[PDB]
């Protein structure tokens, strides 16, 4: 790798909303908290879809509170 011309390229970390954190090297520049990963996806043996993962769905139904 040519060094002066090339961008800085070091180790980072990326955590998922499910609490699964992945150790990987990229060039985002700083750590990030991502919402969906490979494991928490309906197509990758996703028996537990992201419905159980909360968010603005919770705010609405806890706002409304009507079963």
């Amino acid at each position: 790798m040519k060094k002066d011309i090339h961008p800085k390229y070091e180790e980072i970390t990326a955590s998922c909303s499910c609490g699964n954190v992945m150790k990987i090297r990229s060039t985002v520049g700083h750590d990030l908290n991502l919402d969906v990963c490979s494991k928490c996806h309906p197509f990758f043996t996703g028996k537990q879809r992201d419905v159980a993962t909360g968010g603005r769905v919770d705010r609405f139904n806890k706002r409304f509170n009507i079963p």
Binding site: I5, H6, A14, S26, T27, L32, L34, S38, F43, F44
Partner: protein
């Protein structure tokens, strides 16, 4: 090489058992990933191509190749030698890092997801695909990029046919139907 090591401990033997390959290196391995992105509008604005080049250097940590027209085509108003595309080739540890990043984070982030097609193997086992939108990569800062710009991802493999090509991709839990 956090998936290169993953490859050599189970996948090599996994293809060995179910295909009866005589030697272990007969199990294919992905040699390179080519990151292509042809702008096609540099004729309208040269300056959108450098920004596009910067975008691809963010998604994958490499300076992209500026391709030339290579031939004059009047149907698109291009003359040979004109910058028309962007290209990167990744091999080894950088290749594996991009591969795992794609599959684990980005591929789930595809809008209107239904998985990936298993018929685009050109008959020789080498996969090629196109992503519809570019924000899916977390390397690029959302709201700081001018426009959405997709690209093509082609997986060039030593595999001589699509059947063993599908074995290699599936053993990586690649998203097939």
């Amino acid at each position: 090489a956090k998936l290169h090591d993953y490859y050599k401990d189970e996948v090599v033997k996994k293809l060995m058992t179910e295909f009866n390959y005589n030697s272990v290196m007969q199990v294919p391995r992905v040699e390179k990933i080519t990151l292509n992105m042809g702008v096609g509008e540099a004729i309208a604005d040269k300056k959108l191509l450098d920004n596009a080049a910067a975008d691809l250097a963010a998604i994958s940590g490499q300076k992209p190749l500026i391709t030339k027209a290579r031939k004059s085509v009047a149907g698109f108003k291009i003359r040979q030698g004109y910058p028309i595309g962007c290209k990167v080739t990744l091999r080894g540890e950088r290749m594996w890092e991009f591969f795992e990043r794609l599959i684990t984070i980005a591929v789930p982030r595809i809008r209107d997801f239904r998985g990936l097609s298993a018929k685009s193997f050109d008959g020789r086992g080498n996969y090629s695909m196109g992503v519809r939108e570019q924000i899916i990569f977390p390397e690029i800062d959302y709201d700081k990029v001018d426009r959405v710009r997709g690209l093509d991802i082609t997986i060039t493999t030593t595999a001589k046919s699509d059947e063993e090509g599908r074995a290699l991709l599936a053993a990586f839990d690649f998203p097939f139907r």
